[PDB]
Structures are given as structure tokens and as C-alpha cells.
């Protein structure tokens, strides 16, 4: 099977920056190699056809080229919209197979995240169960580390942790962070903490609540 | 004018077998080969095989092989992937995508979750608030439901911007997901905040509205 290496495996770029993403293709396979852009669940988008050709519908900036084993999609000033997975794909043999893909995303000044915690609902609670939410909203850089504390002690069983793709409108990530606990449990404590940890800052963002 | 249309969300057992439709619209379905495609959570895309409509033809390109038999109707335009001993392994995006060399037309994507899980049905809990930070953040907790997918939207959809549905975690046979919904301070309480929560794989849907604690 002809094997196509994609680098960079992740990027982030400015916009306006030219880029220019690589496949290699462990053999041969002429120009029979095509580029694609997908995002977050949806199907990918055929970018470039064959090496260098265009396919209508996509933006002059996005162009293809190479020769062989080593082909490249150059995005000249590459732009918000651009963000998402690049995957190159030859069909100049069977099977036919598809470069491991080349994450990109936009590079965009620091945002410390927007946090809010919620408390177990009333609802919730009728029903036995117990679960606090934080949401930890439109920040950047994507790295983030979020803790629990209740009553001073950092909790990590019962914590379930969610990320966003990159934003659309304002290049930001944001994440929620359930913690989950028996009603029992909830009712034994008092001070629920939600600690995010992001460079912008070097305290930690940290929101919590008593149960009053 | 040319459109793939696949058919929905699957939930099968582990040894069970799914079969997943690709309906072409737009051209001469019995002049192109159909490909299928398998995608897992943030990886790669996998070549499964083709099959040629109308002529029986295909290749077969699956880890495990004897899993997966396509067929197409010619007839209805629609051709088929089968895929029998399922495992964990298969629980994936599968896309049906026209033959050009290169994949102009995909299909949607159908998401395959093999799994002995059985369906339930989602609790939803408002998340109310203790300007707070000049906007105001509500949200909605939908735990407890199986399997994917759960759809959310606020005040019908009318409220989109500042709202964030993040991606459900698998936990104990069980999805929770939540969503945020930013809006001015203005808005809310003044003004109704309702989630609505939609859950086709158990018949429910749900409205909770975001009142003051």
C-alpha cells in the first residue's frame, strides 16, 4: 500500500501567513494525489484535483503542487475560515489511501476563558443524582487544565471534560467540566471549586460556590 | 446538482451486522463506482473498498476480511455496505463518496456505535446562575442518555450566538453532553431562555427553560 506522510501533523498559523502543507507518498503515484480540508463532523472538502488542479467553489488562495512523492498545498495568506484537518489522498494505486492529515488551526492573541460554574440543579437533585458543571468559555491557547476542589480537596474521580473545536467567529476554544457525584456525596460538602489553569495568567482562573 | 445521500445514525451490537445506504442523485448512478470511507474519532480516513453500480464489481480494502459485502440497487439508485461481526473496532463515521479519482461528492456520514449499551432516554437540567461578567452564562446538563446523537438548540433556535454544545462523554454506557448559551443581561431573566433537547434514538424531546434559582 503506498503510504502518504502528511507534515506538519498540527500547525498554528496567523492570518495572512503562506503555508505550505506536505505529503510524501512512500512511492510513486505521478500527480494522482488530492487535497482535502474537513471540519469538525463534516464530510472532507476537495480542495485541489490531481497535484495542482483547481476545483471550482474553492478559494484562488488554496493552491497544490508537486511531483512524484512530494507534493505540497500551499495556502497563500492563509485566512480565519481556513482552520480544520488537511488530508492528501492518491489514487494512483490500489487501495487507495489517505495522508494521515495536517491540523490547522489559527493562531490568535491570548484569551484567558470566560468561567462559570453551576450547581447541581433541583431537578437533579429530586432524581438522587448530583453533577456541577463548569464552563470554561472562548479562550486561547487551546491548552487548559481544569480541577476540581471540594472542600479543598482536588477531585478527580466522577470529572468528565469536554473541548470544542476551534471557534468559527473568534478563533477561541472553549471546554465544560462535569463533576459527578451521589447526592449523599454532594450534601457531605460544602465548597465546590472549578480551577481552570491557562497561560493567560499565572493563577489559575478559579470559580466555586458553597451549597447555600 | 450531484448529491449523496446516506442513511442515519447507527446502534448495533458487538457480532451484529449494519447496513449502511448511499443514495446518488445527479448523474448516471451505474457509470461511477461508489466509495466508501471509514473515519474514528479525530484519525485518519481509511479506504474500505468501491463497488461499481449495476455491475457487481468492488474491492475490498477492510482490516478484518469478510466483514464487509457492498451492494447497490440500480433501481433506487442506492448502494449498500454491510458490515457483520461487528466489533468496537467498527464504531466509526462510515462515508459513501462518488468514484472521480479524487472524492468530489461525499455522502453526510452515518456514525456506527457498536455497543451491547442499551438506548435510554436523556435527563435534562437547567443550568441557572448563581451583568455578571456583562453577559450572562446559562446552560443545560443532558446526562444519562444512549447512544449518540442528541441535538440542542435554544429558544427553538433562535438563539445561537454565544452558545457552545460541547462534545458528549461516554461514560458507563452513558452520554453526557451540556451546552452554554451567553446572552446580555438584558435578555435574561427579562427575556425566556429554553433549551430544547432532542434525542431521535428514544423518541425524546425536551424543553427546559432557564428560570432564576
Known amino acids: 500500500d503506498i503510504e502518504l506522510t502528511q507534515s506538519p501533523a498540527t500547525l498554528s498559523v496567523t492570518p495572512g501567513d503562506s503555508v505550505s502543507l506536505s505529503c510524501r507518498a512512500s512511492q510513486s503515484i505521478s500527480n494522482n494525489l488530492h487535497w482535502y480540508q474537513q471540519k469538525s463532523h463534516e464530510s472532507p472538502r476537495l480542495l485541489i484535483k490531481?497535484?495542482?488542479q483547481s476545483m471550482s467553489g474553492i478559494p484562488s488562495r488554496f493552491s497544490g503542487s508537486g511531483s512524484g512523492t512530494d507534493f505540497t498545498l500551499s495556502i497563500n495568506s492563509v485566512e480565519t475560515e481556513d482552520f480544520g484537518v488537511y488530508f492528501c489522498?492518491?489514487?494512483?494505486?490500489?487501495?487507495?489511501?489517505f495522508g494521515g492529515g495536517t491540523k490547522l488551526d489559527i493562531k490568535r492573541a491570548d484569551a484567558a476563558p470566560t468561567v462559570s460554574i453551576f450547581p447541581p440543579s433541583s431537578e437533579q437533585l429530586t432524581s438522587g443524582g448530583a453533577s456541577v458543571v463548569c464552563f470554561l468559555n472562548n479562550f486561547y491557547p487551546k491548552d487548559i487544565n481544569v480541577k476540581w476542589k471540594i472542600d479543598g480537596s482536588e477531585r478527580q474521580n466522577g470529572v468528565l471534560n469536554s473541548w470544542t473545536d476551534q471557534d468559527s467567529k473568534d478563533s477561541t476554544y472553549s471546554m465544560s467540566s462535569t463533576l459527578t457525584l451521589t447526592k449523599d456525596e454532594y450534601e457531605r460538602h460544602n465548597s465546590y471549586t472549578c480551577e481552570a489553569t491557562h497561560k493567560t495568567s499565572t493563577s489559575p482562573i478559579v470559580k466555586s460556590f458553597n451549597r447555600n | 446538482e450531484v448529491q449523496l445521500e446516506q442513511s442515519g445514525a447507527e446502534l448495533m451490537k458487538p457480532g451484529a451486522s449494519v447496513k449502511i445506504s448511499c443514495k446518488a442523485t445527479?448523474?448516471?448512478?451505474?457509470?461511477?463506482?461508489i466509495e466508501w470511507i471509514k473515519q474514528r474519532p479525530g484519525h485518519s480516513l481509511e479506504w474500505i473498498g468501491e463497488?461499481?453500480?449495476?455491475?457487481?464489481?468492488?474491492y475490498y480494502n477492510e482490516k478484518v476480511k469478510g466483514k464487509v459485502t457492498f451492494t447497490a440497487d440500480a433501481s433506487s439508485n442506492t448502494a449498500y455496505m454491510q458490515l457483520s461481526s461487528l466489533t468496537s473496532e467498527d464504531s466509526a463515521v462510515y462515508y459513501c463518496?462518488?468514484?472521480?479519482?479524487?472524492?468530489?461528492?461525499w455522502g453526510q456520514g452515518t456514525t456506527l456505535t457498536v455497543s451491547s449499551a442499551s438506548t435510554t432516554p436523556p435527563s435534562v437540567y437547567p443550568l441557572a446562575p448563581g451583568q455578571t461578567n456583562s453577559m450572562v452564562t446559562l446552560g443545560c446538563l443532558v446526562k444519562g442518555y444512549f447512544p449518540e446523537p442528541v441535538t440542542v438548540t435554544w429558544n427553538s433556535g433562535s438563539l445561537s450566538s454565544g452558545v457552545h454544545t460541547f462534545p458528549a462523554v461516554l461514560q458507563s454506557d452513558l452520554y453526557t453532553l451540556s451546552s452554554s448559551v451567553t446572552v446580555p443581561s438584558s435578555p435574561w431573566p427579562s427575556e425566556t431562555v429554553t433549551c430544547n433537547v432532542a434525542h431521535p434514538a428514544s423518541s425524546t424531546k425536551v424543553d427546559k427553560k432557564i428560570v432564576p434559582r
Open positions: 445527479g448523474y448516471t448512478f451505474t457509470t461511477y463506482w
Open positions: 463497488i461499481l453500480p449495476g455491475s457487481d464489481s468492488t
Open positions: 463518496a462518488r468514484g472521480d479519482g479524487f472524492y468530489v461528492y
Open positions: 490531481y497535484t495542482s
Open positions: 489522498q492518491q489514487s494512483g494505486s490500489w487501495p487507495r489511501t
